[PDB]
């Protein structure tokens with residue numbers, strides 16, 4: 001049981017690392033998506 | 049008839065358990081089918097802007113609703129796959145979602161343990 | 162042929178609805194649901210016998 | 216391979 | 221997905237990865253472990 | 255661009271009957287609107303011929319009414335584009351990220 005607990009702990013660490021990578025890239029993609037939509041879809045409102 | 053049949057499946061995603069691992073399939077399929085039918089109808093009618101067909105207005109409204117449902121399904125899935133090793137439940141979350149809101153909806157949590 | 166296709170699409174839509182309901186029933190545990198006595202007496206005794214499930 | 220066990 | 225399905229039987233986590241992605245980035249993103 | 259083909263300015267000359275294109279009996283289309291429609295008088299020399307050939311050029315400035323293509327292209331595109339970031343909020347256990 002002790003060995004199982006240690007291995008489960010390491011797997012949990014890997015899972016948390018994956019979650020953190022998802023969160024950072026979610027931040028970046030939200031920023032890029034909003035910035036790009038404003039940059040490339042603002043001009044269309046200007047002309048129309 | 050195809051549009052009505054597709055639109056009748058829009059609400060099914062909210063009765064599908066998070067464990068089956070198939071919410072995304074259903075909601076994405078509904079959205080894409082509605083989009084295809086909207087495109088077909090656009091091909092049929094003249095490309096004029098004096099008024100919008102009622103059927104097209106309905107399909108567009110349903111598409112907005114299904115996009116909202118996809119977002120909500122993603123959030124529900126994220127909530128469902130949470131553990132003490134990664135997240136913490138705030139006390140307000142308990143007092144609300146485990147006590148009050150279930151009572152309003154006639155849910156009656158078992159709380160056997 | 163078109164009439165047959167329409168009829169079958171209606172049936173398949175009904176099957177999708179029923180499959181959502183069946184999946185919902187399948188993923189039930191005591192931690193979240195309690196089985197009503199009528200559910201027991203019907204679905205574990207009577208209907209299975211009618212269907213030769215044993 | 217770690218091959219711990 | 222590749223990072224998520226790692227186990228001690230298949231991989232070893234570097235010390236710097238542990239340090240960074242359990243101390244620095246999580247705080248910078250306003251997320252804290254239990 | 256309208257003009258005489260075989261008669262130079264010294265033989266046939268064009269006169270603007272009136273600057274604006276007449277739209278009194280126009281049949282509105284429902285997709286475009288004529289913002290401006292003006293005829294301009296010009297003369298120019300051609301490498302074919304030693305004389306000056308006049309012409310009147312009409313420019314039709316037409317504006318598109320955007321509701322149709324808005325509804326049928328732009329908003330479906332935005333609704334699909336709103337889902338691009340959701341994959342990063344989807345847990346890895348649910349087994350549906352690649353699908354989305």
Ligand SMILES: CC(=O)OCC[N+](C)(C)C
Nearest residue numbers: 258259260300302303307
């Ligand atoms: C003389 C003659 O036929 O000219 C034709 C070409 N154009 C219209 C440029 C003068």
